[PDB]
Amino acid sequence: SQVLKIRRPDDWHLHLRDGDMLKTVVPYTSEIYGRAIVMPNLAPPVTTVEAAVAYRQRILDAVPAGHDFTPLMTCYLTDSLDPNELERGFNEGVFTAAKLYPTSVDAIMPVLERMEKIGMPLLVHGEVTHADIDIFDREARFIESVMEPLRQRLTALKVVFEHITTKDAADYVRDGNERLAATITPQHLMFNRNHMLVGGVRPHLYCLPILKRNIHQQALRELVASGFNRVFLGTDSAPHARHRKESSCGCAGCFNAPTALGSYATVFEEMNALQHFEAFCSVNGPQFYGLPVNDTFIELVREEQQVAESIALTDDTLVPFLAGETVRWSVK
Amino acid sequence: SQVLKIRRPDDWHLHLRDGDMLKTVVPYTSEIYGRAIVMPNLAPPVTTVEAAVAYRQRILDAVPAGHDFTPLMTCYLTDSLDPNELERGFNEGVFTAAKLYPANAGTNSSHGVTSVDAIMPVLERMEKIGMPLLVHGEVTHADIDIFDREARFIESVMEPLRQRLTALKVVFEHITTKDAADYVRDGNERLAATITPQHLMFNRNHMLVGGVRPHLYCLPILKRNIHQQALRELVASGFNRVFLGTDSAPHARHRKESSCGCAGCFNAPTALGSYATVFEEMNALQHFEAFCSVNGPQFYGLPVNDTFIELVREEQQVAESIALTDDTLVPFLAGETVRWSVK
Ligand SMILES: NC(=O)N[C@@H](CC(=O)O)C(=O)O
Ligand SMILES: O=C1C[C@@H](C(=O)O)NC(=O)N1
Ligand SMILES: [Zn+2]
Ligand SMILES: [Zn+2]
Ligand SMILES: [Zn+2]
Ligand SMILES: [Zn+2]
Fold it and tell me: Gene3D superfamilies under this entry (chain A)?
């Protein structure tokens, strides 16, 4: 019965893969989201304007007719990356942002200084990866040893702290300035590590940064519920074939594009914070990125839908996040 | 190449399953170990003397010719278990010990315990008659973080239980934390513990960095490195109330590598050489025999074995998998080169 009408959302953190997997997964995004930040961690990564242009067109080829969907491309920051290439792609409207995955930050200072100069946002997967650092500590450690020093050196740089998973990060972002923002996935709001590990190990909940203890989940839910306007929707939908997930060494990533929007609606509703839902989905991100809000509207209805058990691929299947479960809100 | 001769070891914590799986896995234990504590968590559990006798015989049936192996049976403690039944199985040599799994108010009375308070008559009887209690020491309340569940058990269940029943002999099975190592180190002659090879060799990073590794997923869950190092320090100390219990806990590959992977490591094939590796790395091989072959017998009041086996420090590859009637088992350290194996 209950219906919620919102400005059409965008997805500020998305993995669309390539080839046949791209063809399968794009429609789950393009049907709902006006735009998405398309991450560059292909094999090999998207590190040139030419590669981004070709990749954008492959994405466009896979968008069903009638979906007004625009992929916002990103550059995978590397050592060899020429700041001129990055800026050129930015000036041509090819690169919307650049993504920093965990030789060093100091090594790419010139590139980062060009981003600061030209007003290009930096998207950060904020974990330090030293073998001596416990996997649950990697996010907190990044803040202290990389994020804060970076932000102090490059005070005009716009940074999105992607897919935050900790109270540490929530507090850091809450207390930051207008040049710092964050995305939060549906899984990090809905679950904590217990959901992944109690009663069985659930690789479909295994993703990076890893699900944390419940106090961290709670800090994230409180952050979105507060109306803080520098957190916004980023699914980190990160699809892997079923048997790459269900294996002796399961890949990290939740395929949550089919279920994310309704899952977010549930969280905000549970937090008595639906008054802040639209801004999270459809306004905060555009504002931070300096892009217009979408001028179309969609409706969610509070009617239970069962999530498919699997989605066919050319070979193997894809298991969606929440496969077989019931979702409380669906897109009308 | 170095040789380590030891008195034949025993495994003070083992899952042998039943049916065809039992037939497959028994030999990995019987070839090496003189005795093993056979856990009772079959479907349905072993909660009666009659079931334990029949299960014992099925295990004996599956022992290859010439292996000198004796299964030591246990009773699964449940709300509905008659203390007279437990006592009678103990008096008749059927039950060597009883096993307490985590309490849960929603458990069927025939399959487990709702609260420890609710099985006091049975625990009192065990105390009375000198039967040891083997504890899987975790609290499983939904609001407790899985990594805290062992430590929470110590405070909430173990310490009060031992304070209530002062004569009760307890094994803290498969300890995984510094909390438990400290608690056991500081306890009295009536408290002991077992430790698995995986909890000595690995921490949670090994299960989660670079990919999720269901063959390292077991309960109690692997903990932080500080906990691993505490365990290693405990065994290497020579402390004599910690002993070998593999918790070898086999599941079909398809049940491990699934959307909801079962907990347990099939470590029977590789455990003994893995313990030798750990003790050697800790410069404590002089304590290795006692851990494997002496400390458990002394705690249980049973004789030490008077035959010997030899480990040899010659590199070997572990099988990638072991065939079952249907599907396959993936052993602990599958495909790896190990340092020590049984001659
Ligand atoms: N989140 C994940 O667990 N995986 C992502 C990468 C990432 O966002 O770090 C992927 O591309 O597979
Ligand atoms: O408590 C347990 C049970 C065991 C099993 O599978 O029997 N496996 C485990 O990992 N630990
Ligand atoms: Zn990331
Ligand atoms: Zn990502
Ligand atoms: Zn156990
Ligand atoms: Zn066990």
Answer: Metal-dependent hydrolases
Decide: A227 and A279 in contact? Cβ < 8 Å.
yes
Which residues, including other chains, have CB under 8 Å from residue A201's CB and lie 6 or more apart? B212, B214, B217, B260, B261, B263
CA-based nearest residue to A116, from A98, A133, A102 = A98
Pair B310, B3: CB distance under 8 Å: yes
- Resolution of the model in angstroms: 1.9
When scoring A135, A201, A210 by the number of chain B Cβ atoms within 10 A, the one with the most, hence best to mutate, is A201
Alpha-carbon B4 to chain mean position: 23
Give which of B213, B168, B200, B170 is closest to B276, Cα–Cα: B200
Q: Which long-range contacts (CB under 8 A, 24 or more apart) does B58-63 make?
A: B58/B18, B58/B22, B59/B16, B59/B22, B59/B26, B62/B22, B62/B23, B62/B26, B62/B27, B63/B26, B63/B27, B63/B30
Whole-number Å distance between alpha carbons of B2 and A247: 37
Provide the b/e sequence for B108-141 (b: ≥16 CB within 10 Å): eeebbbbebeebeebbebbbeeebbbbbbbbbbe
Q: Per the CB < 8 Å rule, is A203 touching B259?
A: yes
From the alpha carbon of B250, which atom of ligand 2 is closest?
A: 6
Catalytic center residues of B = 247
Closest Cα partner for A205 from B176, B217, B106, B264? B217
Three-state secondary structure call for residue A142: helix
DSSP state of A136: G
Q: Do the Cβ atoms of A191 and A214 come closer than 8 Å?
A: no
- Is residue A102 within 8 Å of residue A78, measured between CB atoms? no
DSSP one-letter string for B74-134: EEE--TT--HHHHHHHHHTTSEEEEEEPPP-TTS-TTTS-S-GGGGHHHHHHHHHHT--EE
Query: Domain containing B228 — which CATH number?
Result: 3.20.20.140
- Is B338 in contact with B274 (CB distance < 8 Å)? yes
DSSP state of B174: T
Sign of CA dihedral B109, B115, B118, B121: positive
Query: Number of structural domains, chain A?
Result: 1
Helix H, strand E, coil C: the string for B146-170 is: HHHHHHHHHHHHHHHHHHHCCCCCE
- Name the experimental technique: X-ray
| DSSP type of residue B192 | E
Which listed ligand is nearest to B199 at the C-alpha? 2
State how far residue A111 is from chain B, nearest Cα, in angstroms. 28
Beta strands (DSSP E) in chain B are: 3-7, 11-14, 35-38, 70-76, 95-100, 133-135, 170-172, 191-195, 242-244, 308-312, 316-317, 322-323, 328-329, 337-338, 341-342
CA A161 – CA A172 distance, rounded (Å) = 10
Distance from CA of B66 to the nearest CA of A (A): 36
Vertex B266 angle, CA B316 and A129, to 5° = 80
State the virtual CA torsion across B147, B150, B154, B157 in degrees, nearest 10: 110
- Residue A261 phi, psi (nearest 5): -60, -50
Asked whether the beta carbons of residue A134 and residue B217 sit closer than 8 angstroms, the reply is no
Rounded Cα gap, residues A225 and A164, in angstroms: 15
> Cα separations (Å) of B149 from A172, A210, B91, B225, B330?
30, 19, 34, 17, 27
Give the C-alpha separation, A261 to A28, whole Å.
11
Best CA proximity match to A87, nearest among A120, A54, A51, A39: A120
